[PDB]
Amino acid sequence: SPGVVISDDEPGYDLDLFCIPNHYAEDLERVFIPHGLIMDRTERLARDVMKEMGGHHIVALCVLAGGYKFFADLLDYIKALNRNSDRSIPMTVDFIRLGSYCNDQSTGDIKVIGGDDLSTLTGKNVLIVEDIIDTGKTMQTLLSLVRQYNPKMVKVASLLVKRTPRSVGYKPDFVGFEIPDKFVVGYALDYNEYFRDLNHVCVISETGKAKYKA
Amino acid sequence: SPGVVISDDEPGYDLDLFCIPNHYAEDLERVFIPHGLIMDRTERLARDVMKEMGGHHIVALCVLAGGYKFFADLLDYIKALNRNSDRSIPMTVDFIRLGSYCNDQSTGDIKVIGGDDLSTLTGKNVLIVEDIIDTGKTMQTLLSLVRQYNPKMVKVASLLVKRTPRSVGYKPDFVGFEIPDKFVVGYALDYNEYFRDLNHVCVISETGKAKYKA
Numbered sequence: 001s002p003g004v005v006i007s008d009d010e011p012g013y014d015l016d017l018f019c020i021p022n023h024y025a026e027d028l029e030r031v032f033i034p035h036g037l038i039m040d041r042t043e044r045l046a047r048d049v050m051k052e053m054g055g056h057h058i059v060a061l062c063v064l065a066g067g068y069k070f071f072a073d074l075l076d077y078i079k080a081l082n083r084n085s086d087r088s089i090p091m092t093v094d095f096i097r098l099g100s101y102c103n104d105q106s107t108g109d110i111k112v113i114g115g116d117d118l119s120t121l122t123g124k125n126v127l128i129v130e131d132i133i134d135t136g137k138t139m140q141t142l143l144s145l146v147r148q149y150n151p152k153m154v155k156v157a158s159l160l161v162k163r164t165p166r167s168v169g170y171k172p173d174f175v176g177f178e179i180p181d182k183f184v185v186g187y188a189l190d191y192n193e194y195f196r197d198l199n200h201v202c203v204i205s206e207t208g209k210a211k212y213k214a
Numbered sequence: 215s216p217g218v219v220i221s222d223d224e225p226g227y228d229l230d231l232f233c234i235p236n237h238y239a240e241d242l243e244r245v246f247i248p249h250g251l252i253m254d255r256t257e258r259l260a261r262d263v264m265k266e267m268g269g270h271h272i273v274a275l276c277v278l279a280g281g282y283k284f285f286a287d288l289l290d291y292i293k294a295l296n297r298n299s300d301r302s303i304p305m306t307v308d309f310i311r312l313g314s315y316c317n318d319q320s321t322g323d324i325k326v327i328g329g330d331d332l333s334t335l336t337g338k339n340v341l342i343v344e345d346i347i348d349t350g351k352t353m354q355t356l357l358s359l360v361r362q363y364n365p366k367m368v369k370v371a372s373l374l375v376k377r378t379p380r381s382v383g384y385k386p387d388f389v390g391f392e393i394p395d396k397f398v399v400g401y402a403l404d405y406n407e408y409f410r411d412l413n414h415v416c417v418i419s420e421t422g423k424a425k426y427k428a
């Protein structure tokens with residue numbers, strides 16, 4: 001069950017057919033996933049995490065380090081699906097850090113930095129959430145680590161998956177927009193305190209990255 | 215300012231004059247504040263917070279146990295003012311706990327259930343967001359902490375300030391409302407993993423109140 005197939009070629013769109021912010025003009029090359037574009041995916045993607053997990057007291061858990069947004073919305077897009085229909089969705093939140101090699105250079109390590117609180121999770125229906133799923137390196141550790149305790153279930157929803165070759169080949173179970181090995185930002189994809197007000201997941205420029213480097 | 219302040223004789227509104235979930239029917243008494251009054255009210259706070267705290271870098275940390283939304287939103291509008299205006303304020307967002315109790319009656323305890331990491335909001339105008347200020351035991355503690363590492367500036371946030379005889383005495387720096395002393399649920403206020411898929415901060419009836427007694 002793939003996702004928004006996006007070949008190594010999708011030209012993208014000009015960054016002047018939308019409302020990108022001036023102070024993010026230089027550092028930007030080409031819009032990728034229009035903001036109103038994403039919403040709709042989740043706007044529907046939430047209507048899946050309900051066709052299986054529906055009739056069960058569900059538990060939502062989010063991976064942090066800068067992944068709030070995509071986390072919120074989807075959740076907001078479920079609260080509604082509870083009321084506006086016959087099939088209930090009683091729930092209990094959850095949160096967790098799991099850190100991240102938060103830069104841009106190429107990928108190889110799993111450094112935890114918080115949010116181990118899961119003792120509870122035991123004996124219940126749980127789904128994870130994440131921005132994105134790059135080389136699935138750290139997530140794996142997570143899912144790995146999300147093997148020790150013991151709950152009723154553990155799917156794995158996520159908006160962005162990466163056809164990065166580094167991928168050990170870990171297919172989640174909820175992928176919004178499958179994409180190529182590149183660097184995107186904006187809308188719960190931040191780059192060291194930047195691009196949090198850019199709703200259009202665009203590709204930072206080989207030059208932009210160079211403005212915010214750590 | 216306390217902003218949208220509510221007296222006492224406030225009859226809220228009949229839940230039938232608004233769109234409030236079915237099951238969440240019989241369980242509610244009457245409706246306090248509409249979802250709307252918030253979307254718009256909150257929004258403001260962003261434009262108010264934005265002011266005092268403008269061209270800067272602010273660590274937006276929140277407190278946690280059950281409510282994430284309101285905060286989320288309080289960020290959104292903030293995000294926007296930068297893209298829909300001539301201002302910038304790079305941000306950092308931490309997800310604090312000082313975890314709570316979530317109940318009725320008698321007080322006197324504080325034990326952090328995660329999110330412990332105050333070793334970073336240094337020389338920076340922090341950002342603390344509480345879905346609701348009730349007694350003060352938490353914010354007090356936490357407020358009486360961040361000031362330690364010595365952040366550049368501290369400013370409060372509270373969607374709902376709950377006026378009560380039993381109260382710490384404190385006054386958040388940016389209040390949206392100042393609601394009386396009732397058990398309100400909806401929009402980032404909940405009751406033992408219930409009443410969450412309710413945009414309306416309605417009140418819990420003298421029925422559904424005992425429909426999930428602790």
Ligand SMILES: O=P(O)(O)OC[C@H]1O[C@H](OP(=O)(O)OP(=O)(O)O)[C@H](O)[C@@H]1O
Pocket residue numbers: 063064065066067099100101102103107109130131132133134135136137138139140188189190191
């Ligand atoms: O599975 P992997 O290939 O090892 O990498 C995945 C991790 O990297 C991402 O970082 P993030 O630190 O970027 O935060 P941010 O979401 O805005 O950028 C994301 O949160 C993942 O946990």
Ligand SMILES: O=P(O)(O)OC[C@H]1O[C@H](OP(=O)(O)OP(=O)(O)O)[C@H](O)[C@@H]1O
Pocket residue numbers: 277278279280281282313314315316344345346347348349350351352353
């Ligand atoms: O009595 P006080 O000292 O004033 O305590 C206040 C806290 O307790 C409440 O519950 P809850 O923490 O469970 O929630 P959360 O994640 O949404 O804040 C509320 O959110 C306040 O933050």
Ligand SMILES: Oc1ncnc2c1N=NC2
Pocket residue numbers: 101102103104132134182183184185189190191
């Ligand atoms: O900003 C980012 N931070 C961490 N990992 C990735 C990012 N963009 N693509 C992958």
Ligand SMILES: Oc1ncnc2c1N=NC2
Pocket residue numbers: 316317346348376396397398399403404405
């Ligand atoms: O009314 C309330 N309902 C749920 N939780 C809390 C409340 N006040 N403080 C915490």
Ligand SMILES: [Mg+2]
Pocket residue numbers: 063064065067100130131132
């Ligand atoms: Mg992550």
Ligand SMILES: [Mg+2]
Pocket residue numbers: 277278281343344345346347
């Ligand atoms: Mg709170």
